């Protein structure tokens, strides 16, 4: 059952890597096997102290177990942090590695799943809560006060794995976080509203 | 209610030194409101997390937002890449 489950990920992650060549990047052994939140600080310590991802499958480095995919996730996150720190923040091979990390992390999170407030004091008294919760990463925009116009910026394409200090082309800039809006879509109008007789 | 307002602005000072990541005109475009971040475009219309059937206080930490977004399974994608060549 786990036989084809590596073969398909192999084929997909090969064919979705043509324009950026992430898989054929150089990568030595790098035995960490650590907490994935430590995955850059551990490689920082590996830089301070002192076989690529395609060749890992050809040598059979991954078993049909939980660790046999945890190592694959670990290797992808390492190569993506390396390729983020290697390029500047505006090049196309920065954004391709960011998109490839997003796609592959989404592909590897699923299919291993197959395999204090007065308003709350009113509502938890009045209603019954069946629920659902999840995590998303937010992003940033800039902020400027001109003469009575009070502008905004676009979304910075800085990835979630950048870790750099926040540079600013102006000190009269400000920075803000954009909370994503998410809920049951508000009932859209019918097609009689969209395209009536004018 | 007007339509033809400008709603984008450009400052005269060329600060184009550390700005290759933002949205440039080809300067820097400065809008009159923020952006809107949308998690997933396609709603998953069934799924009793969302449909709420009328039969039978509980919490559930689902993995990611990707449950609510119609993702294809990988065996079809490998089948289609095999059908590619």
């Amino acid at each position: 059952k786990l036989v084809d489950f590596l073969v398909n990920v192999q084929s997909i992650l090969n064919a979705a890597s043509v324009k950026c060549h992430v898989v054929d990047e150089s990568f030595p052994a790098k035995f960490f096997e650590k907490n994935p939140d430590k995955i850059y600080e551990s490689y920082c310590k590996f830089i301070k102290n002192r076989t690529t991802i395609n060749k890992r499958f050809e040598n059979g480095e991954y078993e049909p177990i939980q660790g046999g995919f945890y190592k694959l996730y670990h290797d992808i996150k390492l190569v993506c942090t390396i390729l983020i720190h290697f390029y500047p923040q505006g090049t196309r091979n920065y954004q391709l590695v960011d998109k490839f990390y997003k796609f592959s992390s989404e592909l590897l999170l699923r299919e291993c799943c197959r395999i204090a407030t007065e308003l709350d004091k009113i509502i938890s008294y009045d209603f019954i809560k069946i629920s659902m919760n999840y995590t998303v990463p937010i992003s940033q925009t800039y902020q400027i006060r001109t003469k009575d116009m009070d502008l905004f910026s676009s979304i910075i394409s800085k990835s979630n794995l950048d870790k750099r200090p926040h540079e600013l082309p102006n000190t009269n800039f400000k920075i803000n976080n954009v909370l994503p809006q998410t809920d049951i879509e508000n009932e859209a109008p019918r097609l009689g509203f969209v395209g009536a007789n004018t | 209610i007007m339509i033809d307002a400008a709603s984008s602005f450009v400052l005269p000072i060329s600060i184009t030194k550390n700005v290759d990541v933002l949205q440039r005109t080809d300067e820097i475009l400065w809008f009159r409101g923020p952006s809107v971040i949308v998690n997933e475009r396609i709603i998953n219309s069934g799924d009793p997390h969302l449909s709420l059937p009328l039969n039978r206080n509980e919490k559930e930490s689902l993995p990611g937002p990707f449950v609510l977004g119609l993702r294809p399974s990988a065996k079809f994608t490998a089948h289609r890449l095999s059908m590619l060549r």
Binding site: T146, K147, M149, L151, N172 | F9, V10
Partner: peptide, 29 residues
């Protein structure tokens, strides 16, 4: 910096819709 009135970019609706991209139709010398 707070005295730096910004420049509006006007769209001019007829330019937004259908602008194409005259001697190169040889009938007019």
């Amino acid at each position: 910096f707070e005295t730096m009135v910004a420049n509006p970019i006007k769209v001019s609706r007829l330019q937004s819709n259908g602008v194409l991209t005259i001697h190169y139709s040889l009938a007019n010398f």
